Amino acid sequence: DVLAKELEDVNKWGLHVFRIAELSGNRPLTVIMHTIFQERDLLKTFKIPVDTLITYLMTLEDHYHADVAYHNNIHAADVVQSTHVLLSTPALEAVFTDLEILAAIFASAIHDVDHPGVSNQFLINTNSELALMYNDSSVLENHHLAVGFKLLQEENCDIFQNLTKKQRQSLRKMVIDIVLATDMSKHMNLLADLKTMVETKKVTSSGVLLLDNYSDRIQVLQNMVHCADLSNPTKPLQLYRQWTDRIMEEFFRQGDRERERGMEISPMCDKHNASVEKSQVGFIDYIVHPLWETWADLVHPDAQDILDTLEDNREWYQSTI
Amino acid sequence: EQEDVLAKELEDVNKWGLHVFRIAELSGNRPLTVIMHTIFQERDLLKTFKIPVDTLITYLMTLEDHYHADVAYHNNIHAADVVQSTHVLLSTPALEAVFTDLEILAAIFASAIHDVDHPGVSNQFLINTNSELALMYNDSSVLENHHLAVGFKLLQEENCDIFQNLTKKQRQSLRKMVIDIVLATDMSKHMNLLADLKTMVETKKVTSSGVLLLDNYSDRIQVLQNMVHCADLSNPTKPLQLYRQWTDRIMEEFFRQGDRERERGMEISPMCDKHNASVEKSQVGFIDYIVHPLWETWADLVHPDAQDILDTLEDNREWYQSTI
Numbered sequence A: 001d002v003l004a005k006e007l008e009d010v011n012k013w014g015l016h017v018f019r020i021a022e023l024s025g026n027r028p029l030t031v032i033m034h035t036i037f038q039e040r041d042l043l044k045t046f047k048i049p050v051d052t053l054i055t056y057l058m059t060l061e062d063h064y065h066a067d068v069a070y071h072n073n074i075h076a077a078d079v080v081q082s083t084h085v086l087l088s089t090p091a092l093e094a095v096f097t098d099l100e101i102l103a104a105i106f107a108s109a110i111h112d113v114d115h116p117g118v119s120n121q122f123l124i125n126t127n128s129e130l131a132l133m134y135n136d137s138s139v140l141e142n143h144h145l146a147v148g149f150k151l152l153q154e155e156n157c158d159i160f161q162n163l164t165k166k167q168r169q170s171l172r173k174m175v176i177d178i179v180l181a182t183d184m185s186k187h188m189n190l191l192a193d194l195k196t197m198v199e200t201k202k203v204t205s206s207g208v209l210l211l212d213n214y215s216d217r218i219q220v221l222q223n224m225v226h227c228a229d230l231s232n233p234t235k236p237l238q239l240y241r242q243w244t245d246r247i248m249e250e251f252f253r254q255g256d257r258e259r260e261r262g263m264e265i266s267p268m269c270d271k272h273n274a275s276v277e278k279s280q281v282g283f284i285d286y287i288v289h290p291l292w293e294t295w296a297d298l299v300h301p302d303a304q305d306i307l308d309t310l311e312d313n314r315e316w317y318q319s320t321i
Numbered sequence B: 001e002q003e004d005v006l007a008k009e010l011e012d013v014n015k016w017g018l019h020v021f022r023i024a025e026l027s028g029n030r031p032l033t034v035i036m037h038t039i040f041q042e043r044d045l046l047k048t049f050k051i052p053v054d055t056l057i058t059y060l061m062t063l064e065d066h067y068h069a070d071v072a073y074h075n076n077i078h079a080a081d082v083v084q085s086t087h088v089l090l091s092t093p094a095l096e097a098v099f100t101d102l103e104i105l106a107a108i109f110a111s112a113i114h115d116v117d118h119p120g121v122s123n124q125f126l127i128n129t130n131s132e133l134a135l136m137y138n139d140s141s142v143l144e145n146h147h148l149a150v151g152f153k154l155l156q157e158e159n160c161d162i163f164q165n166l167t168k169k170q171r172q173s174l175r176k177m178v179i180d181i182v183l184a185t186d187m188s189k190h191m192n193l194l195a196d197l198k199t200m201v202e203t204k205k206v207t208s209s210g211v212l213l214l215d216n217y218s219d220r221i222q223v224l225q226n227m228v229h230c231a232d233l234s235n236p237t238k239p240l241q242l243y244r245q246w247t248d249r250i251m252e253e254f255f256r257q258g259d260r261e262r263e264r265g266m267e268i269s270p271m272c273d274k275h276n277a278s279v280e281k282s283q284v285g286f287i288d289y290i291v292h293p294l295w296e297t298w299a300d301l302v303h304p305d306a307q308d309i310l311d312t313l314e315d316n317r318e319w320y321q322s323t324i
């Protein structure tokens, strides 16, 4: 009811996602995905039975760990809703088919599923089952994909049952390509390629960007979900500060497991010699602002408010030092 | 005694055209164990890396067990053959003193594990049938990721860690090199792999001793990647009686996958239809568009070390062509 009221902001940057998590019984992923699907008419377009959508979303959400401070169902819901907003930027108006829109939203929803709260490097260094399965390459991201797709096979969970086989083939490839690109070790190459696309950009009269081949279109979707993954410092400060508390809690719990094991403590994971505030300013200066600056160019001017909130938040964090 | 004859055959371990099928029978279907053990002793690898002999035998037998005895081509005999072929290629004059003991160990180990637990069907088949493997590996080098995961996992079985006395740096470096090599055996990487190898040949540097000069990891791993890929695609370069037995086996494997496909109403993949296969013409096209372009480029890289191998390949191509 109040939940129904908060969801009216589903198209707005800065949605009250923690409120929605509280008001939904810890089901923000299920309710925000359901709303975005209904909003985008995806159940009818792709003949998804609503009970099958709900069943899948709840199983998916159940496989996000509730005892993981950052990489949980609330972050999944947040990346979903963030991608949903960026898909509707005027400078991308219907650039993407309904299948490409389903792909980016579905990939956003599964992109961190069953995250254990430790980094790929930790999984490699502890000789984990996951790193052994995936040969040290994008270990978490390959696992998120495999779980997200595997859950489609549970009873009444195949939300793609009424897609054609080639639609399913095309959707599967796009989702894999998008989620594998969320690995932060791919950030720099992803950004180089986004910059290249900016300096050779092409525009219609009303403003809609022109992408002709799959290669460029998937690359925009990869950077879009990557931006949505890295969108915490662009949200209203009250939201950003809670994201920061959660990621630092997750880092410190990793550094405690590293200390326990007598492993070398990873950067920013030592709760005894951290500077949360200077780390966020560095995060913004070196990762988040270069990314959102290049994205704002690509969709000029639709991202100016987003970029404005980011620069305000960087100035504030700097002022706490 | 069978052991006297087996040991006689194992004296050929440094020669192209080893009787690997006789060794598989003489050894009690243990070609991979006996050939690996022979090569490790020949290269003094047990001493260099402090490998207990019982640990080496135990891992090798467990690894060999995880090749499928009911798969016609991608079995323990293929793995033994690629090991032994890589072992010969490592000894080529153009590469003398180029690679470290650790890199040699990596190339030989990668060859041994490179197809382990192969089920006898292609990556595309596993993608098309929504297999567990393809689901686990997101349709990308599905088999090759699996071969690596199994090969490394078996090191953790009882008395199986043949790398127990390597330093952490050694293990870390070996692990990455093995992964880089086995992932490059995926045939969908072949065109890019061959394109890069051509570039290296066109810009190659040699030392004052006439041996290939490899400055950096990227060039060193590229050569080891193509070395094991060549060994994997070495059947048409072998004496004809070996080559023909390999062709019989790959065709039985292909036909058996096409049977499964034709059952499922799937379109049979090229060359998997026993009711409409052309074995000889397919081998000629395999050599013309894949094996000879690769081996001609490798021959250029190590010229003239591989001239007899390339000559055998060309004769075998002529022979299969004459049977059309």
Ligand SMILES: O=C1Oc2cc(O)ccc2/C1=C/c1ccc(OC(F)F)c(OC2CCCC2)c1
Binding pocket: A182, A183, A184, A185, A229, A232, A233, A240, A243, A244, A245, A247, A268, A279, A280, A283
């Ligand atoms: O650190 C990270 O490694 C990753 C790896 C991935 O593959 C994906 C996402 C992340 C990721 C995400 C992340 C999200 C929010 C952060 O701060 C704030 F916005 F909440 C954040 O800050 C860290 C990094 C520097 C200062 C602390 C990090």
Ligand SMILES: O=C1Oc2cc(O)ccc2/C1=C/c1ccc(OC(F)F)c(OC2CCCC2)c1
Binding pocket: B185, B186, B187, B188, B232, B235, B236, B243, B245, B246, B247, B248, B250, B271, B282, B283, B286
């Ligand atoms: O077909 C294959 O797909 C692969 C995929 C891989 O990733 C690695 C290896 C192979 C591979 C190997 C292979 C090996 C030997 C063959 O012929 C003969 F030498 F035994 C062979 O012939 C086939 C293909 C062309 C006509 C029949 C194929």
Ligand SMILES: [Mg+2]
Binding pocket: A111, A112, A140, A182, A183
């Ligand atoms: Mg992630």
Ligand SMILES: [Mg+2]
Binding pocket: B114, B115, B143, B185, B186
């Ligand atoms: Mg293989």
Ligand SMILES: [Zn+2]
Binding pocket: A075, A079, A111, A112, A182, A229
């Ligand atoms: Zn994420």
Ligand SMILES: [Zn+2]
Binding pocket: B078, B082, B114, B115, B185, B232
């Ligand atoms: Zn092979």
